[PDB]
XYZ file of N, CA and C in Angstrom:
861
model
N 23.522 -33.653 1.696
C 22.493 -33.631 0.602
C 23.157 -33.172 -0.326
N 23.275 -33.820 -1.861
C 24.610 -33.608 -2.865
C 24.487 -32.922 -4.017
N 24.162 -32.049 -4.199
C 24.284 -30.896 -5.480
C 24.702 -31.108 -6.533
N 26.554 -30.893 -5.928
C 27.723 -30.230 -6.954
C 27.589 -30.832 -8.038
N 27.779 -29.979 -9.384
C 27.986 -30.420 -10.196
C 28.870 -29.962 -10.989
N 29.368 -30.804 -11.467
C 31.312 -30.958 -11.860
C 30.979 -30.974 -13.557
N 31.300 -29.246 -14.313
C 31.165 -28.854 -15.789
C 32.823 -29.332 -16.145
N 31.703 -28.905 -17.673
C 32.723 -28.641 -18.646
C 33.523 -27.258 -18.428
N 34.621 -27.287 -18.656
C 35.993 -26.152 -18.404
C 35.185 -25.406 -19.547
N 34.987 -26.176 -21.134
C 34.652 -25.959 -22.182
C 32.932 -25.611 -22.139
N 31.994 -25.531 -21.570
C 30.803 -25.440 -21.476
C 30.613 -23.243 -20.585
N 32.048 -22.905 -20.734
C 32.206 -21.141 -20.134
C 32.261 -21.058 -21.118
N 31.733 -19.317 -21.293
C 32.521 -18.343 -22.145
C 32.809 -17.084 -20.862
N 34.348 -16.766 -20.918
C 34.650 -15.578 -20.440
C 34.441 -14.229 -20.946
N 33.320 -13.536 -20.317
C 33.408 -12.240 -20.865
C 34.733 -11.134 -20.760
N 34.014 -10.057 -19.208
C 34.921 -9.578 -18.316
C 35.533 -10.388 -17.488
N 36.907 -9.304 -16.819
C 37.004 -9.403 -15.561
C 36.408 -8.513 -14.562
N 35.793 -9.002 -13.862
C 35.359 -8.617 -12.567
C 36.698 -8.031 -11.011
N 37.273 -9.040 -11.244
C 38.294 -8.934 -10.058
C 39.551 -9.570 -10.234
N 40.163 -9.616 -9.693
C 41.835 -10.865 -9.748
C 42.245 -10.171 -8.496
N 42.577 -11.702 -7.510
C 43.684 -11.405 -5.868
C 45.263 -11.921 -6.666
N 45.387 -12.602 -5.842
C 46.734 -13.393 -5.949
C 46.312 -15.189 -5.697
N 45.215 -15.364 -5.369
C 44.673 -16.303 -4.511
C 44.072 -17.289 -6.418
N 43.901 -16.156 -7.604
C 43.217 -16.018 -8.936
C 42.061 -15.092 -9.180
N 41.949 -15.312 -10.145
C 40.702 -13.310 -10.669
C 39.757 -14.635 -11.024
N 38.596 -13.416 -11.241
C 36.764 -13.360 -11.599
C 36.198 -13.118 -12.524
N 35.595 -14.278 -13.100
C 34.946 -13.038 -14.579
C 33.457 -13.100 -14.509
N 33.206 -12.675 -15.004
C 32.178 -12.974 -15.653
C 31.665 -13.045 -17.095
N 30.841 -14.802 -16.431
C 31.076 -15.357 -17.503
C 29.926 -16.147 -18.301
N 29.677 -16.842 -18.221
C 28.119 -17.037 -19.313
C 29.061 -18.697 -19.650
N 27.560 -20.063 -18.980
C 27.601 -20.900 -18.968
C 26.749 -21.066 -20.101
N 27.512 -21.942 -20.962
C 26.130 -22.779 -22.083
C 26.110 -24.205 -22.474
N 25.300 -24.958 -21.301
C 25.285 -25.854 -21.560
C 25.452 -26.857 -22.850
N 26.122 -27.901 -22.906
C 26.257 -28.748 -23.905
C 25.178 -29.523 -24.519
N 25.113 -29.601 -25.861
C 23.771 -29.786 -26.808
C 22.659 -29.052 -26.321
N 23.108 -27.255 -25.759
C 22.156 -26.496 -25.351
C 22.303 -25.097 -26.397
N 21.093 -24.427 -26.734
C 21.009 -23.186 -27.418
C 21.347 -22.052 -26.067
N 20.773 -22.193 -25.032
C 21.184 -20.796 -24.298
C 21.626 -20.760 -23.864
N 22.435 -19.580 -23.210
C 23.365 -18.844 -22.668
C 23.120 -17.906 -21.572
N 23.688 -18.775 -19.994
C 22.799 -18.298 -19.238
C 24.225 -17.720 -17.894
N 23.966 -16.864 -17.265
C 25.121 -15.274 -17.137
C 25.889 -16.405 -15.183
N 26.954 -16.689 -15.385
C 27.217 -16.716 -14.139
C 28.375 -15.751 -14.014
N 29.254 -16.044 -12.500
C 30.955 -15.743 -12.356
C 31.334 -16.613 -12.476
N 32.237 -15.752 -12.741
C 33.459 -17.499 -12.811
C 35.389 -17.120 -11.958
N 35.164 -17.991 -10.660
C 36.552 -17.698 -9.586
C 36.855 -18.745 -10.076
N 38.072 -18.631 -10.795
C 39.068 -19.810 -11.397
C 40.713 -19.171 -10.866
N 41.021 -20.535 -10.116
C 42.127 -20.255 -8.943
C 43.705 -20.720 -10.123
N 44.408 -19.748 -9.620
C 45.469 -19.386 -11.112
C 46.732 -20.176 -11.116
N 47.063 -21.049 -9.564
C 48.480 -21.575 -9.752
C 47.586 -23.480 -10.181
N 47.512 -23.951 -11.018
C 47.488 -25.352 -11.009
C 47.538 -26.453 -9.192
N 47.143 -27.480 -9.133
C 46.759 -28.090 -8.346
C 46.956 -29.295 -8.291
N 47.931 -29.516 -7.196
C 48.024 -31.471 -6.846
C 46.442 -31.705 -6.033
N 46.838 -32.781 -6.917
C 46.039 -33.622 -6.688
C 44.920 -34.322 -4.678
N 45.400 -33.693 -4.131
C 45.331 -33.277 -2.617
C 45.070 -32.249 -2.416
N 45.287 -31.390 -3.066
C 44.837 -29.996 -2.971
C 43.147 -30.585 -4.030
N 43.538 -30.693 -5.101
C 42.068 -30.603 -5.586
C 41.488 -31.772 -5.120
N 41.732 -32.677 -4.224
C 40.537 -33.907 -2.999
C 39.617 -32.536 -2.637
N 40.434 -32.143 -2.053
C 40.226 -31.030 -0.507
C 39.167 -29.993 -0.851
N 39.986 -29.467 -2.228
C 38.633 -28.578 -2.501
C 37.203 -29.205 -3.257
N 37.508 -29.970 -3.432
C 36.117 -31.298 -4.032
C 35.825 -31.442 -3.059
N 36.515 -31.757 -1.744
C 35.715 -32.107 -0.584
C 34.890 -30.931 0.446
N 35.420 -30.127 0.058
C 34.969 -28.704 0.926
C 33.965 -28.110 -0.169
N 34.159 -27.992 -1.662
C 32.999 -28.112 -2.551
C 31.432 -28.222 -3.114
N 31.272 -29.963 -2.393
C 30.344 -30.634 -1.749
C 29.620 -30.238 -1.252
N 30.283 -29.857 -0.186
C 29.439 -28.653 0.851
C 28.781 -27.294 0.353
N 30.426 -27.076 -0.349
C 29.275 -25.451 -0.609
C 28.040 -25.502 -1.743
N 28.166 -26.312 -1.993
C 27.174 -26.593 -3.101
C 25.518 -27.290 -2.737
N 25.788 -27.165 -0.675
C 24.179 -27.712 -1.120
C 23.819 -26.713 0.947
N 24.555 -25.058 0.485
C 24.355 -24.496 1.511
C 22.893 -24.000 2.166
N 21.621 -23.485 2.977
C 20.746 -23.266 3.178
C 21.085 -21.845 3.416
N 21.917 -21.648 4.234
C 22.183 -20.374 4.612
C 21.575 -18.701 3.664
N 21.555 -18.251 3.984
C 21.059 -17.000 3.630
C 22.431 -15.999 3.263
N 23.400 -16.332 4.179
C 24.243 -15.035 4.122
C 25.872 -15.824 3.759
N 25.887 -17.479 3.151
C 26.474 -17.523 2.481
C 26.292 -18.528 1.166
N 27.006 -17.481 0.026
C 26.815 -18.404 -1.566
C 27.105 -19.578 -1.971
N 26.243 -20.370 -1.920
C 25.725 -21.704 -2.868
C 26.830 -21.743 -3.905
N 27.522 -22.807 -3.921
C 28.560 -22.991 -5.086
C 26.972 -23.004 -6.321
N 27.339 -22.899 -7.980
C 26.954 -23.377 -8.433
C 27.102 -25.030 -9.367
N 28.573 -24.827 -9.446
C 28.726 -25.579 -10.088
C 30.805 -25.554 -10.403
N 31.578 -26.642 -11.036
C 32.749 -26.614 -10.620
C 33.756 -27.689 -11.637
N 34.124 -27.001 -12.851
C 35.048 -27.096 -13.650
C 36.428 -27.763 -12.547
N 37.326 -28.934 -12.601
C 38.227 -30.154 -11.871
C 39.299 -30.231 -12.762
N 39.063 -30.853 -14.293
C 39.597 -30.889 -15.182
C 41.245 -30.610 -14.430
N 42.257 -29.494 -15.820
C 43.617 -29.093 -15.072
C 42.848 -27.843 -14.077
N 43.580 -26.547 -14.239
C 42.735 -25.627 -13.814
C 41.861 -25.982 -12.838
N 41.647 -25.483 -11.562
C 40.213 -25.036 -11.467
C 39.345 -24.436 -11.080
N 37.559 -24.553 -11.789
C 37.232 -23.344 -11.475
C 35.443 -23.264 -11.094
N 35.542 -22.074 -9.992
C 34.240 -22.021 -9.548
C 33.460 -21.367 -9.700
N 32.271 -21.848 -10.189
C 30.681 -21.146 -11.238
C 30.259 -20.807 -9.733
N 29.500 -19.891 -10.181
C 29.157 -19.632 -8.682
C 28.201 -18.316 -9.434
N 27.019 -17.563 -8.753
C 26.294 -16.275 -8.939
C 26.158 -15.494 -9.295
N 26.297 -14.856 -10.093
C 26.649 -13.146 -10.425
C 25.795 -11.962 -8.678
N 27.340 -11.380 -8.822
C 26.477 -10.620 -7.854
C 26.282 -8.981 -7.410
N 26.402 -8.502 -8.642
C 26.823 -7.544 -9.351
C 26.724 -5.727 -8.391
N 26.508 -6.100 -7.407
C 26.804 -4.840 -6.101
C 28.215 -5.048 -5.296
N 28.786 -5.550 -6.131
C 29.997 -5.955 -5.593
C 30.669 -6.251 -4.350
N 31.361 -6.555 -4.143
C 32.359 -6.673 -2.814
C 31.536 -6.042 -1.337
N 31.819 -6.193 0.112
C 31.410 -5.375 0.679
C 32.307 -4.492 1.225
N 34.127 -4.709 1.273
C 34.728 -3.816 1.344
C 34.814 -3.027 0.248
N 34.165 -2.596 -1.153
C 34.629 -1.721 -2.099
C 33.404 -1.311 -1.199
N 32.843 -1.724 -1.462
C 31.324 -0.751 -0.554
C 30.920 -0.027 0.337
N 31.563 0.202 1.286
C 31.821 0.131 1.711
C 32.905 1.843 2.199
N 33.997 1.664 1.434
C 34.572 2.553 0.737
C 33.708 3.704 0.389
N 33.454 3.589 -0.385
C 32.232 5.009 -1.713
C 30.850 4.898 -0.540
N 30.273 4.833 0.070
C 29.774 4.632 0.454
C 29.359 4.918 2.151
N 30.715 5.257 2.152
C 31.310 5.593 3.758
C 29.870 7.234 4.319
N 29.933 7.476 4.049
C 29.117 8.829 4.595
C 27.302 8.551 4.378
N 26.879 7.626 4.400
C 25.214 7.113 3.987
C 26.215 5.414 4.374
N 26.333 5.012 5.070
C 26.322 3.643 5.888
C 26.236 4.047 7.233
N 25.263 3.960 7.951
C 24.400 4.139 9.132
C 24.637 3.203 10.293
N 24.755 3.199 11.918
C 25.284 2.060 12.560
C 24.378 0.654 12.496
N 22.783 1.242 11.971
C 22.324 -0.872 11.818
C 22.623 -1.058 10.671
N 22.870 -0.193 10.013
C 24.047 -1.131 8.828
C 24.966 -1.973 9.688
N 26.256 -1.517 10.030
C 27.610 -1.685 9.786
C 27.341 -2.830 10.208
N 26.272 -3.139 11.786
C 25.943 -3.265 12.911
C 25.360 -5.430 12.195
N 24.474 -4.649 11.244
C 23.629 -5.901 11.411
C 24.270 -6.883 10.195
N 25.770 -5.992 9.721
C 26.160 -6.736 8.612
C 27.019 -7.973 9.156
N 27.331 -7.269 10.786
C 28.337 -7.956 11.679
C 27.401 -9.404 11.991
N 25.753 -9.223 12.239
C 25.136 -9.992 12.545
C 25.157 -11.514 11.677
N 25.047 -10.724 10.685
C 24.959 -11.766 8.794
C 26.751 -12.949 9.394
N 27.506 -11.940 8.873
C 28.440 -12.398 8.536
C 28.544 -13.357 9.841
N 28.422 -12.888 10.693
C 28.752 -14.385 12.157
C 27.942 -15.489 11.528
N 26.609 -15.301 12.206
C 25.396 -16.724 11.102
C 25.868 -16.887 9.898
N 26.500 -16.258 9.150
C 27.222 -17.747 7.735
C 28.290 -18.548 8.361
N 29.197 -17.966 8.964
C 30.437 -18.312 10.160
C 29.938 -19.841 10.807
N 29.079 -19.131 11.577
C 28.220 -20.235 12.159
C 28.124 -21.382 11.805
N 27.407 -20.869 10.213
C 27.342 -22.177 9.623
C 28.064 -22.915 9.457
N 29.056 -22.898 8.557
C 30.194 -23.407 8.281
C 30.400 -24.035 8.823
N 30.580 -23.229 10.895
C 30.976 -23.682 11.464
C 30.279 -25.922 11.663
N 29.346 -25.770 11.711
C 27.952 -26.954 12.026
C 28.045 -27.584 10.628
N 29.013 -26.893 9.674
C 28.675 -28.082 8.688
C 30.962 -28.961 8.407
N 31.389 -28.278 9.626
C 32.904 -28.577 9.203
C 33.588 -27.556 8.857
N 33.214 -27.024 8.110
C 34.265 -26.262 7.387
C 34.897 -24.777 8.503
N 35.996 -25.157 7.983
C 37.063 -24.294 8.272
C 37.173 -22.990 6.952
N 37.019 -21.660 7.215
C 36.987 -20.648 6.034
C 38.285 -20.670 4.852
N 39.259 -19.967 6.787
C 40.148 -19.795 6.085
C 40.625 -18.732 5.290
N 39.718 -18.027 4.512
C 39.976 -16.631 4.255
C 39.167 -15.809 4.278
N 38.329 -15.788 5.310
C 37.358 -14.205 5.899
C 38.344 -13.095 5.229
N 37.463 -12.550 5.223
C 37.573 -11.235 5.017
C 36.674 -10.154 4.182
N 36.583 -9.204 4.389
C 35.873 -7.981 4.179
C 35.777 -7.933 2.072
N 36.979 -8.341 2.098
C 36.705 -8.545 -0.074
C 36.250 -9.661 -0.406
N 35.991 -10.558 1.097
C 35.194 -12.197 0.477
C 33.696 -11.478 1.217
N 33.394 -10.791 1.127
C 31.940 -10.245 1.704
C 30.921 -10.102 0.252
N 30.269 -10.011 0.086
C 29.357 -10.037 -1.495
C 28.468 -9.365 -0.809
N 27.731 -8.069 -1.632
C 26.634 -7.249 -1.156
C 25.128 -7.552 -2.321
N 24.273 -8.609 -1.949
C 23.935 -9.244 -2.440
C 22.325 -8.210 -2.800
N 22.579 -7.244 -1.683
C 21.284 -5.643 -1.668
C 22.181 -5.077 -0.101
N 22.131 -3.823 0.051
C 23.234 -3.498 0.852
C 22.454 -3.925 2.355
N 21.672 -4.481 2.429
C 20.334 -5.162 3.431
C 20.947 -6.904 3.987
N 22.495 -6.955 2.866
C 21.810 -8.566 2.648
C 23.770 -8.849 2.131
N 24.017 -8.702 3.336
C 25.320 -9.568 2.604
C 25.778 -11.272 2.813
N 26.955 -11.824 2.103
C 26.691 -13.229 2.124
C 28.350 -13.641 2.354
N 28.512 -14.857 2.315
C 30.778 -15.210 2.793
C 30.399 -15.674 1.441
N 31.594 -15.795 0.599
C 32.134 -16.072 -0.488
C 33.315 -16.880 -0.191
N 33.496 -18.232 -1.421
C 35.201 -19.000 -0.713
C 35.407 -19.045 -2.264
N 36.360 -18.564 -2.528
C 37.772 -19.190 -3.036
C 38.328 -20.057 -3.682
N 37.848 -20.980 -2.884
C 38.911 -22.304 -3.201
C 39.677 -22.845 -1.456
N 39.637 -21.710 -1.171
C 40.806 -22.193 0.390
C 40.172 -22.915 1.134
N 38.607 -23.091 1.266
C 37.776 -23.231 3.150
C 38.675 -25.306 2.542
N 37.752 -25.775 3.735
C 38.792 -27.017 3.987
C 37.720 -27.600 5.042
N 37.546 -28.987 4.526
C 36.729 -29.937 5.809
C 37.206 -30.311 6.527
N 36.816 -30.619 8.110
C 37.441 -31.371 8.853
C 36.788 -32.926 9.364
N 37.717 -33.644 8.944
C 37.446 -34.660 9.696
C 36.311 -35.187 10.528
N 36.325 -36.155 10.886
C 34.882 -35.872 11.671
C 35.926 -36.645 12.725
N 37.012 -36.479 12.771
C 37.788 -36.571 14.079
C 38.244 -35.123 14.675
N 38.638 -35.243 13.222
C 39.723 -33.604 13.265
C 39.704 -32.430 14.096
N 39.930 -31.270 14.404
C 39.650 -30.580 14.849
C 40.538 -29.598 14.358
N 41.817 -29.700 13.875
C 42.842 -28.712 13.072
C 42.540 -29.192 11.518
N 43.617 -27.792 11.534
C 44.108 -28.727 9.482
C 44.747 -27.995 9.483
N 46.098 -28.607 9.760
C 47.471 -28.004 8.846
C 46.970 -27.732 7.567
N 47.805 -26.630 7.279
C 48.693 -26.579 5.618
C 49.786 -26.451 5.690
N 49.812 -26.841 4.063
C 51.386 -26.540 3.742
C 51.892 -25.268 2.538
N 52.571 -25.484 2.517
C 53.582 -23.292 2.306
C 52.038 -23.447 0.868
N 52.383 -21.631 1.027
C 51.954 -21.407 -0.986
C 51.208 -19.716 -0.045
N 51.326 -19.354 -1.040
C 50.456 -17.995 0.192
C 49.458 -16.905 0.678
N 49.150 -16.664 1.369
C 48.919 -16.580 2.963
C 48.223 -14.553 2.490
N 47.525 -14.372 2.692
C 46.370 -12.821 3.363
C 47.104 -13.046 5.491
N 48.018 -12.476 5.290
C 48.847 -12.522 6.418
C 47.995 -12.360 7.392
N 47.523 -10.568 7.054
C 47.209 -10.007 7.955
C 45.421 -9.846 8.337
N 44.802 -11.407 7.663
C 43.739 -11.735 8.377
C 44.111 -13.148 9.516
N 45.213 -13.502 9.284
C 45.277 -15.395 10.160
C 45.422 -14.752 11.605
N 44.526 -15.537 12.474
C 45.441 -15.920 14.182
C 46.948 -15.812 13.567
N 47.090 -16.218 15.123
C 48.995 -16.579 15.248
C 49.220 -17.848 14.154
N 49.001 -18.957 15.110
C 48.450 -20.174 15.017
C 48.908 -20.321 13.472
N 47.679 -19.553 12.823
C 47.948 -19.643 11.676
C 49.513 -19.428 10.662
N 49.582 -17.617 11.363
C 51.234 -17.449 10.745
C 52.023 -18.363 11.646
N 52.005 -19.154 12.622
C 53.515 -19.486 12.734
C 53.432 -21.199 12.252
N 52.506 -21.505 13.328
C 52.172 -23.512 12.049
C 51.745 -23.950 11.457
N 51.084 -23.152 10.617
C 50.100 -22.894 9.616
C 49.113 -24.193 10.065
N 48.654 -23.847 11.520
C 47.267 -24.473 11.677
C 45.817 -23.459 11.969
N 45.120 -24.395 11.276
C 43.871 -23.816 11.332
C 42.799 -24.378 12.007
N 41.692 -23.027 13.283
C 40.856 -24.065 13.332
C 39.559 -22.666 13.090
N 38.131 -23.689 13.740
C 37.518 -22.503 13.663
C 38.126 -21.173 14.612
N 37.815 -21.608 15.154
C 38.816 -20.411 16.389
C 39.524 -19.531 15.928
N 40.840 -19.797 14.681
C 41.047 -18.919 14.254
C 40.539 -18.138 12.797
N 39.345 -19.203 12.371
C 38.316 -17.692 11.964
C 37.260 -17.246 12.643
N 38.022 -17.395 13.749
C 37.178 -16.197 15.446
C 37.558 -14.766 14.446
N 38.827 -14.743 14.745
C 40.727 -13.598 14.637
C 39.819 -13.472 13.179
N 39.822 -13.844 11.794
C 39.272 -13.263 10.811
C 38.515 -12.613 11.228
N 37.149 -13.152 11.588
C 35.848 -11.578 11.746
C 36.024 -10.850 12.290
N 36.816 -10.789 13.302
C 37.575 -9.917 14.117
C 37.888 -9.033 13.098
N 39.332 -9.240 11.884
C 39.725 -8.142 11.530
C 38.329 -7.790 11.240
N 37.705 -8.508 10.030
C 36.715 -8.419 8.753
C 36.325 -7.022 9.744
N 35.345 -7.184 11.036
C 34.852 -6.477 11.516
C 35.337 -4.668 11.876
N 36.529 -5.349 12.064
C 37.808 -3.424 11.738
C 37.199 -3.210 10.543
N 37.865 -3.905 10.010
C 37.844 -3.173 8.486
C 36.464 -2.419 8.250
N 35.610 -3.226 8.528
C 34.541 -2.731 8.265
C 33.509 -0.835 8.983
N 33.897 -1.477 10.000
C 34.017 0.349 11.403
C 35.091 1.379 11.051
N 36.335 0.518 10.372
C 37.224 1.897 9.773
C 36.435 2.132 8.370
N 35.303 1.984 7.760
C 35.140 1.597 6.488
C 35.718 1.365 5.642
N 36.855 0.447 5.504
C 37.325 -0.263 4.652
C 38.869 0.244 4.663
N 39.199 0.909 5.614
C 40.607 0.591 6.097
C 41.959 -0.183 5.958
N 42.980 -0.482 5.312
C 43.823 -1.128 6.015
C 44.390 -1.924 6.636
N 44.276 -3.173 6.950
C 45.121 -3.446 8.119
C 46.723 -3.580 8.112
N 46.996 -2.657 9.499
C 47.959 -2.178 9.481
C 48.921 -2.267 8.407
N 48.051 -0.267 7.958
C 48.791 0.108 6.801
C 50.607 0.218 6.748
N 51.383 -0.090 6.365
C 52.563 0.516 6.476
C 53.182 -0.721 6.656
N 52.847 -1.264 7.971
C 53.070 -2.611 8.396
C 53.990 -3.896 7.488
N 54.935 -3.580 6.866
C 55.154 -5.604 6.525
C 55.141 -6.330 6.786
N 54.613 -7.456 6.342
C 54.134 -8.207 6.483
C 54.525 -9.723 6.591
N 56.073 -9.180 6.893
C 57.212 -10.218 7.505
C 57.747 -9.846 9.177
N 56.800 -8.448 9.613
C 57.068 -7.939 11.313
C 55.727 -8.401 11.604
N 54.596 -9.366 10.576
C 53.527 -9.102 11.723
C 53.219 -9.572 12.655
N 53.999 -11.125 12.381
C 54.172 -12.145 13.591
C 54.875 -12.389 15.023
N 55.064 -10.987 14.895
C 56.455 -11.043 15.816
C 55.428 -9.132 16.759
N 55.024 -8.664 15.857
C 54.567 -7.177 16.767
C 53.019 -7.966 17.402
N 52.478 -9.115 17.043
C 50.924 -10.131 17.301
C 51.712 -10.011 19.188
N 53.009 -10.606 18.625
C 53.211 -11.598 19.861
C 53.646 -10.783 21.565
N 54.003 -9.124 20.728
C 54.549 -8.372 22.023
C 52.683 -8.116 22.762
N 51.483 -7.621 21.687
C 50.307 -7.536 22.366
C 49.352 -6.679 21.737
N 50.526 -5.451 20.678
C 49.738 -4.910 19.733
C 49.438 -5.199 18.997
N 47.862 -4.941 18.207
C 46.512 -5.194 17.846
C 46.070 -3.916 16.979
N 45.296 -3.920 16.039
C 44.972 -3.331 15.455
C 44.297 -1.796 16.203
N 44.130 -0.842 15.913
C 43.939 -0.198 17.361
C 41.925 0.445 16.713
N 41.670 0.645 18.309
C 39.824 0.657 17.932
C 39.292 2.179 17.533
N 38.782 1.490 16.114
C 37.695 2.927 15.422
C 37.287 3.860 15.784
N 37.208 4.801 15.457
C 36.785 6.063 15.931
C 35.220 6.071 16.150
N 34.694 5.494 15.713
C 33.153 5.337 15.692
C 33.003 4.097 16.746
N 33.763 3.503 17.155
C 33.707 2.216 17.664
C 33.301 2.852 19.651
N 32.452 1.753 20.701
C 32.557 2.491 20.784
C 32.949 1.181 22.571
N 33.570 1.680 23.399
C 34.751 0.072 24.096
C 33.902 -0.966 24.453
N 32.742 -1.359 23.947
C 31.623 -2.331 24.299
C 32.075 -3.607 22.417
N 32.364 -2.957 21.899
C 32.117 -3.729 20.759
C 33.586 -3.641 19.806
N 34.828 -2.740 20.399
C 36.603 -3.037 20.237
C 36.650 -4.085 21.178
N 35.744 -3.712 22.989
C 36.492 -5.343 23.201
C 35.847 -6.423 23.322
N 35.313 -6.793 21.798
C 34.479 -7.825 21.430
C 36.349 -7.938 20.449
N 36.370 -7.321 19.720
C 37.040 -7.358 18.721
C 38.029 -7.627 19.081
N 38.716 -6.579 20.334
C 39.720 -7.320 20.997
C 39.893 -8.735 21.221
N 39.300 -9.121 22.332
C 38.431 -10.763 22.264
C 38.896 -12.078 20.952
N 38.616 -10.965 20.030
C 39.267 -12.253 18.891
C 40.389 -12.056 18.730
N 41.202 -11.818 18.796
C 42.106 -11.169 19.133
C 43.319 -11.656 20.023
N 42.796 -12.897 21.079
C 42.991 -13.170 21.931
C 44.361 -13.744 21.562
N 45.429 -14.278 21.840
C 46.235 -15.994 22.082
C 46.142 -16.851 21.367
N 45.457 -16.866 23.200
C 44.581 -18.014 23.359
C 43.348 -19.008 22.718
N 43.353 -19.408 21.779
C 42.198 -19.555 21.014
C 41.428 -19.780 21.403
N 41.414 -20.523 22.760
C 40.320 -21.113 23.981
C 39.956 -19.991 24.239
N 39.778 -19.097 23.809
C 39.394 -17.754 24.865
C 39.012 -16.440 23.837
N 38.903 -17.214 22.827
C 37.886 -16.250 21.773
C 36.943 -16.829 21.730
N 35.854 -15.480 21.300
C 33.973 -15.953 21.047
C 33.861 -16.779 19.890
N 33.409 -17.849 20.465
C 31.629 -18.169 19.517
C 31.621 -18.159 18.733
N 31.506 -18.609 17.168
C 30.617 -17.807 16.420
C 29.218 -17.699 16.825
N 28.280 -19.085 17.669
C 27.757 -18.607 18.020
C 27.233 -17.421 19.573
N 28.049 -17.691 20.291
C 28.623 -16.158 21.221
C 28.002 -15.112 20.972
N 28.931 -14.823 19.033
C 28.882 -13.714 19.239
C 27.866 -13.526 17.630
N 27.188 -14.045 17.305
C 25.632 -13.572 16.254
C 24.895 -13.575 17.239
N 24.854 -13.151 19.233
C 24.504 -13.690 19.852
C 24.256 -11.453 20.820
N 25.964 -11.345 21.418
C 26.144 -9.773 21.387
C 25.861 -8.949 20.242
N 25.880 -9.343 18.909
C 25.923 -8.352 17.558
C 24.315 -7.991 17.223
N 23.863 -9.098 17.857
C 22.326 -8.733 17.719
C 21.730 -8.118 19.137
N 21.857 -8.312 20.060
C 20.898 -7.231 21.370
C 21.888 -5.585 20.656
N 23.052 -5.474 20.481
C 23.474 -4.727 19.275
C 23.031 -3.636 18.533
N 22.466 -5.164 17.623
C 21.928 -4.127 16.302
C 20.557 -4.301 16.922
N 19.737 -4.433 18.026
C 18.550 -3.600 18.166
C 18.863 -2.570 19.263
N 19.824 -1.567 19.129
C 20.375 -0.227 19.742
C 21.790 -0.094 19.059
N 21.783 0.672 18.293
C 22.730 0.564 17.615
C 23.392 1.985 17.699
N 22.847 2.583 18.411
C 22.925 4.704 17.698
C 23.999 4.307 19.495
N 23.517 3.112 20.014
C 24.190 3.183 21.933
C 25.405 2.028 21.661
N 25.955 1.937 20.589
C 27.473 1.126 20.778
C 28.234 1.911 19.516
N 27.832 2.172 18.494
C 28.517 3.240 18.074
C 28.786 4.606 17.613
N 29.369 5.310 17.303
C 28.805 6.885 18.099
C 29.954 7.212 16.031
N 28.448 6.870 15.287
C 28.336 7.500 13.797
C 27.509 9.079 14.072
N 28.873 9.699 12.637
C 27.775 11.318 12.852
C 26.949 11.292 12.132
N 26.117 12.208 11.841
C 24.809 11.723 11.683
C 24.365 10.800 11.374
N 23.326 10.484 12.180
C 23.988 8.753 11.710
C 22.213 8.666 12.126
N 21.365 9.330 12.184
C 19.938 8.841 11.767
C 19.556 9.558 10.647
N 19.766 10.075 9.783
C 20.520 11.322 8.926
C 20.635 9.591 7.675
N 20.415 8.915 7.711
C 20.760 7.731 6.750
C 19.554 6.451 6.141
């Protein structure tokens, strides 16, 4: 179904800055319709680098899907400004992203929450798969907290829609988040749903470690060759062999030997219904 509204970028007033990556900055803004006097609070993700009419078209393509999501675990796109620079308009999310969240509630996050967040992120991703979207930038900094028991996956415009025949999306050059990408992605600039699984795996590591940096210290220049050896992100302290051994399956070289997002919703659910068996967190019942 078609819901995407394309809006005049002069209908938006930018107010405060909520963030800024390298792919663009996020504003706390204010949509003020034209010919109207009401002013409605939105959040505005604006992309830094201007975009080729191919980039524009692919975004526009991806955005008609994002403007129609049913899933509770994906942020629905509210609107978009295309003009010169592209701006994704989207609902305000006051609790912040999940990464910043775990970093300052580390002492109060228990196993039920961690495991439930994993189930939700997976659910959200599986939905996008069913919609033929390759998310291309899954990370914990791109997961938002609606409420601490309810996280949602969000897009900053780097998602791509697979043709009805396509299985891969080969990407041009640009700035990339290396420490979350599959290998095929770092070498061949190829992206599959299966690569999203790689990223999912890193995101989860991020959470189990309570907001640690992947490969902290190591420069992005090396990652590609470190992987080729067989080294991966280390097992988190709270993790049991059962949880880690899933993460690891996500960082398999042969992307056909990674778990599918639906297989992943199943394992993490059976775990989320007996959390103390799977994560060994200190003072776990006391939260």
